DNA sequence: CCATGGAGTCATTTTATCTTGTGTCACTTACAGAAAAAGTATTACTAATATATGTTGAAAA
DNA sequence: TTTTCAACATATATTAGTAATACTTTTTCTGAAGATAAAATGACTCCATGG
């Protein structure tokens, strides 16, 4: 839980794609205990605001394992401006980002008329 | 018969059992009438049924009678502890130690710990930190503690300073330090005619107690006196005979480090015992 | 008193050893575990919130 | 039958107070050829007694 968050905030500040829920499954643990310890070392240190992630980053790496073909890049821009407006349309806030990202991907994918199941997305 | 030869072969054990020296040869010494694989089938099962045991020493392998106390004990013990536990009590006196159980059991230190701690809750083995260095925690039976260890730590001189005071009185008459010469007045008459030790008498004087301890042997007393031979508080003459060096005066040009004090400020000309080295 | 036996010293081999081996560019790439200390995670409480999550199941098509 | 709801619930985080236990850490703390030599070889000789 210590080396976890200590490794975490870094790749957070660099604004890359890595995710706490993703970060735990290296262990049997709960994505709470890690989250708890994390948010505590936010108190015992004093840390800047910068690490605010958006789906616009995660949709890149999520798109990688989607298989498919070159079209996804098109889908990428199809998804991106989608999610962007979704952030603008005001129903983005206060939600676990990885989920709404996957939702955007399902949309643009269907927008590009392919068949990819929900399981295949949440994987 | 399993139950019959079980109980009568337990009867030769509970009566005598040929002590600990009993090997399988003594079986044929008493009852050899049974066929080999049969008497051994029931030996094997009674050890499985924990009505007999086997000890590992010398030629062949030893057997002994065992009751349900330690039998239900070891059957209640885990498969880990199974060979471990009974192998531990093999010492029974001196105990055995951590890594030397690891090689014999062919386990890690990972697992042998938890079964030991299990035996700690069980309290059939106790942590013992012996004479040799306290890195050990050798383990003997929680019940028995015969061991090699006065004690190895302080309150030695506590009694030394007392015995010295008596030994002093044994030499010439008592202290007699007031004016220039009070001692001995030529040791009573003819100091030669007083031929005297302290030795054995110490033990009778040690009876005084006034301290928390047990008694002590003539042997260790001799060492107690050897120290004051080395400190040269007193003197070793003619075996157990002992005198004092008159260095009770040490209690209170020249030679006598005491009654002397250094200057040790300012002036740089002094005699150290270092700065040549 | 003298030839002898025994040893003590003193050349003499044969084994165990170590320093060398032409020059110049031009790139290249202290062990492990033991114990003590510090600190913490539950372990209950409301108590508001608002997602996730599961299931299920009920309700509808 | 399936789908949408719903709904039930339960974590999830704060701030506390305890108090006690258990549990991880950390921090001590020790149990290639030709000189050089070394030794076995052997002869020399002092020095022993005895017929």
Swiss-Prot record, chain A:
Location in or out of the cell: Nucleus
Taxonomy, superkingdom: Eukaryota
Ranges for the Sequence repeats: 62-123
Coiled-coil intervals, chain numbering: none
Misc remark: Present with 4330 molecules/cell in log phase SD medium.
Oligomeric form and interacting partners: TFIIIB comprises the TATA-binding protein (TBP), the B-related factor (BRF) and the B' component (TFC5).
Family: Belongs to the TFIIB family.
Its biological purpose: General activator of RNA polymerase III transcription. Interacts with TBP. Binds to Pol III subunit C34 and to the TAU135 component of TFIIIC.
Protein name per the record: Transcription factor IIIB 70 kDa subunit
Swiss-Prot record, chain B:
One Pfam family cited in the UniProt record for this chain: RNA_pol_Rpc34
Keywords of this entry: DNA-directed RNA polymerase, Nucleus, Transcription
This protein's record includes keyword Repeat: no
Main location group: nucleus
The UniProt record lists the keyword Nucleus: yes
Biological process per Gene Ontology, one example term: termination of RNA polymerase III transcription
Subcellular location: Nucleus
InterPro entries hit by this protein: RNA_pol_Rpc34, RNA_pol_Rpc34-like, WH-like_DNA-bd_sf, WH_DNA-bd_sf
Effect of residue 126 to A: Cold-sensitive. Abolishes interaction with BRF1/TDS4
GO CC term, one of those recorded: cytoplasm
Superkingdom, taxonomy of origin: Eukaryota
Function description: DNA-dependent RNA polymerase catalyzes the transcription of DNA into RNA using the four ribonucleoside triphosphates as substrates. Specific peripheric component of RNA polymerase III which synthesizes small RNAs, such as 5S rRNA and tRNAs. Involved in recruitment of Pol III to the preinitiation complex. Involved in the configuration of an initiation-competent form of RNA polymerase.
UniProt record similarity statement: Belongs to the eukaryotic RPC34/RPC39 RNA polymerase subunit family.
Subunit structure and binding partners: Component of the RNA polymerase III (Pol III) complex consisting of 17 subunits. Interacts with BRF1/TDS4.
Name the UniProt record assigns to this protein: DNA-directed RNA polymerase III subunit RPC6
């Amino acid at each position: 839980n210590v080396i976890a968050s200590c490794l975490y905030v870094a790749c957070r500040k660099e604004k890359t794609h890595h995710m706490l829920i993703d970060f735990s499954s290296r262990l049997q643990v709960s994505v709470y205990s890690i989250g708890a310890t994390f948010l505590k070392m936010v108190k015992k240190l004093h840390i800047t605001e910068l690490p605010l992630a958006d789906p616009s980053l995660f949709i890149q790496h999520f798109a990688e394992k989607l298989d498919l073909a070159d079209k996804k890049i098109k889908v990428v821009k199809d998804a991106v401006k989608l999610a962007q407006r979704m952030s603008k349309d005001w129903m983005f806030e206060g939600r676990r980002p990885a989920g709404i990202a996957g939702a955007c991907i399902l949309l643009a994918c269907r927008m590009n008329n392919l068949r990819r199941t929900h399981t295949e997305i949440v994987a | 018969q399993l139950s019959d030869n079980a109980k009568t072969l337990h009867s030769q054990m509970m009566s005598k059992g040929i002590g600990a020296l009993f090997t399988q040869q003594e079986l044929q010494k008493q009852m050899g009438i049974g066929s080999l694989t049969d008497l051994m089938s029931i030996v094997q099962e009674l050890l499985d049924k924990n009505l007999i045991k086997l000890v590992k020493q010398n030629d062949e392998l030893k057997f002994q009678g065992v009751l349900e106390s330690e039998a239900q004990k070891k059957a209640t013990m885990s498969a880990e502890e199974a060979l471990v536990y009974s192998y531990i009590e093999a010492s029974g006196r001196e105990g055995i130690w951590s890594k030397t159980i690891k090689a014999r059991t062919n386990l890690h230190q990972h697992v042998v710990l938890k079964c030991l701690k299990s035996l700690e809750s069980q309290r059939y083995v106790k942590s013992v930190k012996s004479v040799k260095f306290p890195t050990r925690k050798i383990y003997m039976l929680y019940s028995l503690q015969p061991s090699v260890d006065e004690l190895d730590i302080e309150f030695i001189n506590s009694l030394l300073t007392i015995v010295w005071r008596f030994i002093s009185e044994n030499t010439f008459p008592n202290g007699f330090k007031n004016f220039e010469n009070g001692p001995k007045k030529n040791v009573f008459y003819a100091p030669n005619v007083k031929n005297y030790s302290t030795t054995q008498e110490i033990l009778e004087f040690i009876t005084a107690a006034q301290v928390a301890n047990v008694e002590l042997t003539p042997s260790n007393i001799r060492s107690l006196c050897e120290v004051l031979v080395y400190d040269d508080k007193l003197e070793k003459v003619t075996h157990d005979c002992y005198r004092v060096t008159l260095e009770s005066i040490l209690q209170m040009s020249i030679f006598n480090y005491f009654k002397m004090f250094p200057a040790s400020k300012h002036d740089k000309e002094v005699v150290y015992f270092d700065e040549w080295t």
